[PDB]
Amino acid sequence: MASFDGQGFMMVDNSWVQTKAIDVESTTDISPYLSKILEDSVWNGNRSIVFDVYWDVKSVSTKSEWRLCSVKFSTKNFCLFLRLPNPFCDNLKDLYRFFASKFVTFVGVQIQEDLALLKENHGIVIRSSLEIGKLAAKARGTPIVEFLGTRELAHKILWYDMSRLDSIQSKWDEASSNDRLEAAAIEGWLIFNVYDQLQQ
Amino acid sequence: MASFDGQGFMMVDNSWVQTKAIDVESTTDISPYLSKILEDSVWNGNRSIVFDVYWDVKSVSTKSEWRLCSVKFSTKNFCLFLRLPNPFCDNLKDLYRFFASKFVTFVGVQIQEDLALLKENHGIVIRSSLEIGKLAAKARGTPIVEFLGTRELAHKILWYDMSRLDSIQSKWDEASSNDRLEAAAIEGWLIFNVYDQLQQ
Amino acid sequence: MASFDGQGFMMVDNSWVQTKAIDVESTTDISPYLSKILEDSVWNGNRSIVFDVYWDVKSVSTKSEWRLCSVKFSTKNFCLFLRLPNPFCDNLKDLYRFFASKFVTFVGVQIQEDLALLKENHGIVIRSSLEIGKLAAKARGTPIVEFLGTRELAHKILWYDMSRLDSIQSKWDEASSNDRLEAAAIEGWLIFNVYDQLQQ
Amino acid sequence: MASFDGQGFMMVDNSWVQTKAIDVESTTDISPYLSKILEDSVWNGNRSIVFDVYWDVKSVSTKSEWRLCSVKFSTKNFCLFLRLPNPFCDNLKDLYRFFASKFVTFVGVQIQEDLALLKENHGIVIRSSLEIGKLAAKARGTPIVEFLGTRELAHKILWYDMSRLDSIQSKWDEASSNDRLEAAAIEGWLIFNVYDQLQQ
Amino acid sequence: MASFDGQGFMMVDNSWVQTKAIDVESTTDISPYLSKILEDSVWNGNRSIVFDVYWDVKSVSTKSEWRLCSVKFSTKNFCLFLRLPNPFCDNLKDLYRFFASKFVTFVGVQIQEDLALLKENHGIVIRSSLEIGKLAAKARGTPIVEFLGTRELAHKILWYDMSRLDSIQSKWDEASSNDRLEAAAIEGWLIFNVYDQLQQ
Amino acid sequence: MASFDGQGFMMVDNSWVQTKAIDVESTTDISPYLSKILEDSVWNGNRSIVFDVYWDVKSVSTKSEWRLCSVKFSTKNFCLFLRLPNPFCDNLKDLYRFFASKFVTFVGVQIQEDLALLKENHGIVIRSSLEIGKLAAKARGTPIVEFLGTRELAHKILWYDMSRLDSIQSKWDEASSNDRLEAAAIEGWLIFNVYDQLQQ
């Protein structure tokens, strides 16, 4: 299959996240990596995929223009990181089709504005999504969690140690590429566990 | 009246689902098949028709264009699969009229975005629809049910065996067309039983 | 007054419903027939008028165009059927005035999309409508009733026999124009009774 | 002052409604009549004015065009009826300014669509309005009344006799100008009393 | 600092309200007067400022154009009345900046439509507003309070004497400009006390 | 790291707040200063960053144009003030990226209109915001708190002394730039504490 041969990281409960970052381009086939994510979601994930999307902004002095520059998919064992070109290449069809799948649910934190931007700027549609803060808010009856970011939401639901995460993110500008990737992988693993808890 | 002479499939409760997949051309008359679906819905389904819709995306490097390419209708005994052409032939107004029928209720999983895409891109309108996860959530007082995909919703409400489905969907990239049909038919049958349960 | 000289039908409680279908033309005066409907609604219907609208779709291979092709008005004792020309003739402003009336409440099943299409395509405005399912769902406290079509809703609220209706609709394509008229007459009658039971 | 010298009518509790119908035109000064309405609203009406608006529709074969053709203002002792020209004349400024007053509350029945049409087609804005069915729905906790027209709403709240009203409106097409006016005056008086009850 | 040397008025609780009405010209500096209002709001009003806005409508025979012509600001001790020119002079950005202040909360009666008109026609924006009837309704559990005008709301919550107000407003067409100011000042004082009551 | 070498201020609980105001230019690097804010937010602020935005309006005699002229970021220990040029310089995409961050939650008072103006005029998007009043209103069950400005909200939740703040703001026009900076610093500090008390 497709190997997630990038730098891995150990979480605070000893479990491991395998990573792969791909600079997608006209000739890159990401179907095997997406295939892996889905497989892991079906077997070991209760059909969830935690995701985040990252924007680049240009031409702010004129009329600011937002473009999706990368997306993260995290399952139980994997964290896939796709850096997207500008503009998209047609093979990214696969990504559009993936995001629209109902085989799974795309779990994210504060994603209201993202879903809008994805539609407006790229026509990317996510038919099966869950803004997990809203679900936590209802299920736990504690209204604050609707408004927390990834870390603080995870802290109110899981109370795991987040020392390493907090460390990397407090000095974000100085963090190496490997460090940035690690934080992303932790955030992924954290939200995966917030969902695991809310689904049972 | 009309013959569902494609590959049939056996569900985990030993009931048989008959199938038919059609490539709608300008000279194809789908009216006999919709009649069979309607007739089965009326006598054996409490006037529900399970549906899903499938999209192809084109031209994402410039301005993506979504387009409806297949629809699936399921009742207790039948699964109908229509593959649609680009563009539509004029005789597909039969399908438009069918979707707008108040004789039945079109039941689907996570269809909010679909309904929107059907209007914007085709002016297909569904006057009688039910997004089943919403109803289930409200009736069973378990909020998470609203944000689940087909399989995971079906699991929380029926607890039937889904090994076969999971097996097919986990390795979707390498599944035969016959396998994919089976998955679709199973999902149809599952959603139907979900509805059967919430309607009494 | 005007005469409902068309085919009458007996309901399952042995009460008679008179009908009239009209092919509205520029020379046709529908005012006596609306008058009769209105009159019956005031004396015998608690000022309810049950309605349904029917659409024709054209030009689906291109840019679909929806047009109101007929409307049905049902009271306790009458069912009026109006087939409408394309385009409307200018005397159809009598229908516009009627729909906008506050003398009555127009009762329909699953009419959200209908009201919208009536605005976009014709500027038909209904100032006093009731989506009967939404009201029943609230009153009876059975949330599913909001999403049922005409027959299935009537069943959960009335439990009258509906074998005749089911029989005609299950083989709709093979139903004579007289049979189809009867089915419409019955749905009207059924919905009138659902309203009757909820207004008291 | 301005005299309400038109045909008056006795209600079923013996009280009297004085009327005036005015065909407003470029040279008509309606300020004294509006002044009267406001006076009566301040003294004897708890600062309410019941209103209704009447539309004419044109050019239905083409693109239907709605224009406000008349408006009714009812207080405790008065029913003012203004027939508006096409187009408005500039002196109707006074009416725009009146409708925007916060000295009072404009009470009406099913006015959601009207407020939209008034804004879209004339830029008429009503800053202090009350759709009285919604208020009755809350206060009385009986959800049906949100959807009733003028008469049936009045019947559920007041249980006065409405024989004469029902009579006129069942044979609306045959009713003399005086008859039509009378119904309007009763509806006014009825809603005034529905409000009187809900305000104490 | 700035002198409110217009006609003062005595409220029914024997407290004195000082007034000032200004015709804002391009060389008028309203900043001293807004400062006084702010200062009084800060020390004696719990940072509330009562406001109303007044509209002139033009050109209704063709396409009506609404335009803001006066605003009133009230605190416990002061009532400021600004008559605005057509068009605005550039120095009215002071007023724009004042309305956008988060130092205070702009309290008004039935202001939903006003806020909309202020944006559409002037891009005046009020970041900190309170539609007081909404708050009152929610806090006192009496739904009707939301739909009341200034006087009638003030009556249901304070039960002060309003003979003077009622006297002036009932014969508004023949009230001196001094009388009209008094009415405005009184209304300001009433709404302020309404807020004083709901804020503790 | 970067130095907050501007005028520091003591709060009413004897804790020090360091400040820095910057006149952002094309050559100015704000990244160290945002880094410091972020760092303090992670270690000492439960990942909250308190913010306020300030607008300049132009061309009011014509068609008003709103432009973001400065923004304030407050944590437990720092207050950062950024005055922004017109137009923005292209390196301000660092501010865009920062506002869009999910590492933190941006906490503000009455920010509905702000978020909207930030979108219409600049495409500034805040993916993780909290309107603190709306949260407090829900938690404390005191509905008025949703509509209060910064000081009055802080008063109902904290009851700290605010004489210094009130003193500066009551004579705002006569306040030195140093005084105005202090007021902004305090509001930040106050809101931080309101958040602190609601997150625990």
Author numbering:
A (entry chain A), B (entry chain B), C (entry chain C), D (entry chain A), E (entry chain B), F (entry chain C): 1 to 200
What are the paper's exact sentences on this?
RICE1 is a novel RISC-bound cofactor in Arabidopsis. RICE1 and RICE2 function as 3’-to-5’ exoribonucleases that specifically degraded ss RNAs. We also determined the crystal structure of RICE1 and observed that it formed a homohexameric ring with the active sites uniquely embedded at the interface between monomers. We propose that RICE1 and RICE2 act to clear 5’ uridylated fragments from RISC cleavage and to facilitate RISC recycling.
To elucidate the catalytic mechanism of RICE1, we have determined the crystal structure of RICE1 at 2.9 Å resolution. RICE1 crystallizes in space group I4122 with three molecules in the asymmetric unit. RICE1 molecules form two donut-shaped hexamers that interact with each other in a face-to-face manner in the crystal lattice. RICE1 exhibits an α/β fold with a central seven-stranded β-sheet sandwiched between eight α-helices. Structural analysis of RICE1 using the DALI server revealed that RICE1 exhibits structural homology to the DnaQ family of 3’-to-5’ exonucleases including WRN-exo (r.m.s.d 2.4 Å to 2E61) and recently reported RICE2 (r.m.s.d 0.7 ~ 1.2 Å). A comparison of RICE1 with WRN-exo and other members of the DnaQ family revealed that the DEDD motif is not conserved in the active site of RICE1. Instead, the glutamate and the last aspartate residues in the DEDD motif are replaced by Tyr54 and Glu187. Notably, no obvious electron density corresponding to the active site Mg2+ ion of the DnaQ-like nucleases was observed near the active site of RICE1, despite the inclusion of 5 mM of MgSO4 in the protein sample for crystallization. Asp52 and Asp114, two residues that otherwise bind to divalent cations, interact with Lys102 and Arg127 of a neighboring RICE1 molecule. Moreover, the active site of RICE1, unlike other DnaQ family members, is located at the interface between RICE1 subunits within the hexameric ring.
